[PDB]
Amino acid sequence: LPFSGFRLQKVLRESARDKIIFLHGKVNEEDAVVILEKTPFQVEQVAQLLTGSPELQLQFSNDIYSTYHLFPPRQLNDVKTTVVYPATEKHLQKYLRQDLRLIRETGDDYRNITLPHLESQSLSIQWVYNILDKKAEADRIVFENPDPSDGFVLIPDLKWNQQQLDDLYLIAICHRRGIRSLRDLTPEHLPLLRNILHQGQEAILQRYRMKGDHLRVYLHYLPSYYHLHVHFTALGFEAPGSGVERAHLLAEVIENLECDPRHYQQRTLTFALRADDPLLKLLQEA
Amino acid sequence: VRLPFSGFRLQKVLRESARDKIIFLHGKVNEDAVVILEKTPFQVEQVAQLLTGSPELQLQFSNDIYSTYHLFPPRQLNDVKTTVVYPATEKHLQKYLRQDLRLIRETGDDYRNITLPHLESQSLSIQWVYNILDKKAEADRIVFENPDPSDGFVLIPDLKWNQQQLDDLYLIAICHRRGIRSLRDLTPEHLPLLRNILHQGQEAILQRYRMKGDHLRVYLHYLPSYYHLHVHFTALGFEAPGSGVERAHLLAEVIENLECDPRHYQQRTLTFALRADDPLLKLLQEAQQ
Numbered sequence: 366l367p368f369s370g371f372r373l374q375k376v377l378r379e380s381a382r383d384k385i386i387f388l389h390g391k392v393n394e395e396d397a398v399v400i401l402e403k404t405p406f407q408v409e410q411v412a413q414l415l416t417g418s419p420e421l422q423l424q425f426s427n428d429i430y431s432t433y434h435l436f437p438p439r440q441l442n443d444v445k446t447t448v449v450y451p452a453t454e455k456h457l458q459k460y461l462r463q464d465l466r467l468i469r470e471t472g473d474d475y476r477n478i479t480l481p482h483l484e485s486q487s488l489s490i491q492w493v494y495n496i497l498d499k500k501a502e503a504d505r506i507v508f509e510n511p512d513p514s515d516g517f518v519l520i521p522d523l524k525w526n527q528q529q530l531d532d533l534y535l536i537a538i539c540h541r542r543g544i545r546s547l548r549d550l551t552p553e554h555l556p557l558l559r560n561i562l563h564q565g566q567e568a569i570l571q572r573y574r575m576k577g578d579h580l581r582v583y584l585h586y587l588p589s590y591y592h593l594h595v596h597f598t599a600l601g602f603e604a605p606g607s608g609v610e611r612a613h614l615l616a617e618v619i620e621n622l623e624c625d626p627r628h629y630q631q632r633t634l635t636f637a638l639r640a641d642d643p644l645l646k647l648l649q650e651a
Numbered sequence: 652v653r654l655p656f657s658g659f660r661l662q663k664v665l666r667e668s669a670r671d672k673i674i675f676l677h678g679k680v681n682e683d684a685v686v687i688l689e690k691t692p693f694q695v696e697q698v699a700q701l702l703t704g705s706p707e708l709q710l711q712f713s714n715d716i717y718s719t720y721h722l723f724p725p726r727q728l729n730d731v732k733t734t735v736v737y738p739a740t741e742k743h744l745q746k747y748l749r750q751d752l753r754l755i756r757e758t759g760d761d762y763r764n765i766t767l768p769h770l771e772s773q774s775l776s777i778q779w780v781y782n783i784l785d786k787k788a789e790a791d792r793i794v795f796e797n798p799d800p801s802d803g804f805v806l807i808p809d810l811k812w813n814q815q816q817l818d819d820l821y822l823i824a825i826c827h828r829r830g831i832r833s834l835r836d837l838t839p840e841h842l843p844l845l846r847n848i849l850h851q852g853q854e855a856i857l858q859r860y861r862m863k864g865d866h867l868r869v870y871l872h873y874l875p876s877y878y879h880l881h882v883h884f885t886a887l888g889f890e891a892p893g894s895g896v897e898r899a900h901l902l903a904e905v906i907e908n909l910e911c912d913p914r915h916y917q918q919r920t921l922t923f924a925l926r927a928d929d930p931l932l933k934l935l936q937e938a939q940q
């Protein structure tokens with residue numbers, strides 16, 4: 366660990382459905398957030414285990430049904446662990462359990478209300494520029510188009526432990542700066558968006574043997590961070606923000622802009638916002 | 652100590668969720684066993700004390716203030732809930748099976764040339780829908796009705812929603828008008844029907860279950876499970892199957908699509924997933940190569 370002596374302060378969030386926990390702890394006594402998530406199963410190793418001597422412990426039995434506790438060997442026990450240190454107050458609110466509300470943001474709303482709210486915020490995306498500038502994660506890059514205007518870096522997302530294809534998850538981060546979200550897209554960006562889609566899919570084919578009809582390829586709105594990026598996920602993975610209230614398919618985004626240059630300037634977008642988000646109030650009053 | 656069979660040989664992964672950390676395995680033994688494995692929730696006290704005391708971490712990568720690891724915790728954190736069905740009837744295998752899907756981008760032309768003729772090659776009875784609409788069956792289940800034959804609908808709960816909690820709220824709106832198979836048939840003629848579903852459907856859920864519209868995901872499926880126009884009202888906190896961008900279409904945006912673009916659902920390419928063994932997939936692929 367990059368610190369010593371974690372002291373619990375608050376379980377920020379806890380999900381039995383996702384088997385994931387978000388903890389705020391004090392260290393070096395400085396705030397840190399530790400995220401722990403049980404990992405996906407490896408089917409061949411589990412099968413191999415079931416045909417041997419697995420450590421089982423019968424909970425109950427009812428004729429054809431029986432429920433056990435299983436304690437696999439060390440290799441099958443991997444827990445996905447993410448540390449954010451030093452953590453800011455942003456991070457402590459961000460990962461907290463809150464209730465979401467749906468909101469329909471018109472094209473006027475965006476430029477008059479949402480954009481000025483975003484522009485009033487001082488956001489950190491140094492991790493994004495570290496990837497682009499080859500300061501971090503240089504040799505994790507699966508593909509890069511180095512053109513400053515229409516180029517991008519395709520790289521595994523932090524969520525993905527990379528140990529199985531079932532939850533395959535890569536992000537494409539564009540080299541061009543100042544494109545914050547889906548709202549900023551015009552026909553100017555068609556060649557970049559097309560590069561991401563078609564070059565992103567070929568790289569994933571060549572690297573992972575995953576065909577394009579196996580990929581759900583989308584952007585988030587609202588995004589979690591404001592530097593345009595596209596998510597490449599296995600269709601069988603119920604991936605983060607893949608619901609219709611957040612995910613916008615790249616193929617569709619390209620075609621929307623081809624039919625109507627002002628699409629993402631003019632059209633109402635629908636998305637979820639946290640109850641304690643000041644943006645939610647500002648949109649509700651306008 | 653031991654399982655009730657020998658030689659567990661994997662036949663098929665019936666189901667897997669990477670998000671839920673669950674796998675349903677079909678194995679031959681010795682003769683059909685289903686082993687269902689689910690990783691368990693975290694116990695906070697065990698994590699908290701592990702993290703103060705000599706944890707076995709291994710770095711995946713770091714960047715700035717972020718770092719990810721592989722943690723191999725001690726025994727108490729490693730419990731995997733393991734359910735065995737043995738023997739497994741075909742009914743078991745079929746209820747745990749979801750075939751893997753493939754994406755297809757159907758053009759307006761593909762729908763006319765390929766998908767619609769395939770649909771008309773099949774006979775699928777929707778009589779159960781008409782029996783609800785005509786009040787011969789499930790009249791006691793209807794929560795709201797606009798009885799108008801052109802612009803009206805029926806609001807009925809999902810059959811898996813017991814109405815014991817608002818968390819998994821799920822109702823369905825079925826229109827009185829017949830002949831609207833799917834999204835592909837929608838025109839500005841149906842806008843009064845569609846605004847009634849959205850606005851009256853939301854108002855009736857507010858009044859009955861005390862849930863506001865900004866708590867509701869209101870959407871159509873394409874492809875639909877049955878070809879008589881219907882809409883899903885779910886709680887936002889309920890990420891129910893079918894609400895993925897690749898199947899779901901928000902009713903609000905469908906209304907507005909047709910408001911500024913009359914022939915959208917006849918002209919535009921729609922994206923959906925088909926089961927790998929679905930003969931409609933084959934046709935569409937062959938017609939696109």
Ligand SMILES: Nc1nc(N)c2c(OCC3CCN(Cc4ccccc4F)CC3)cccc2n1
Nearest residue numbers: 459460492502520521522523524536589714717
């Ligand atoms: N390749 C790669 N990919 C990433 N996504 C990286 C990274 O991401 C930071 C976080 C920022 C927040 N989220 C999503 C999120 C999850 C829970 C709660 C709120 C959220 F916004 C996305 C991941 C941070 C640092 C390095 C990263 N490297």
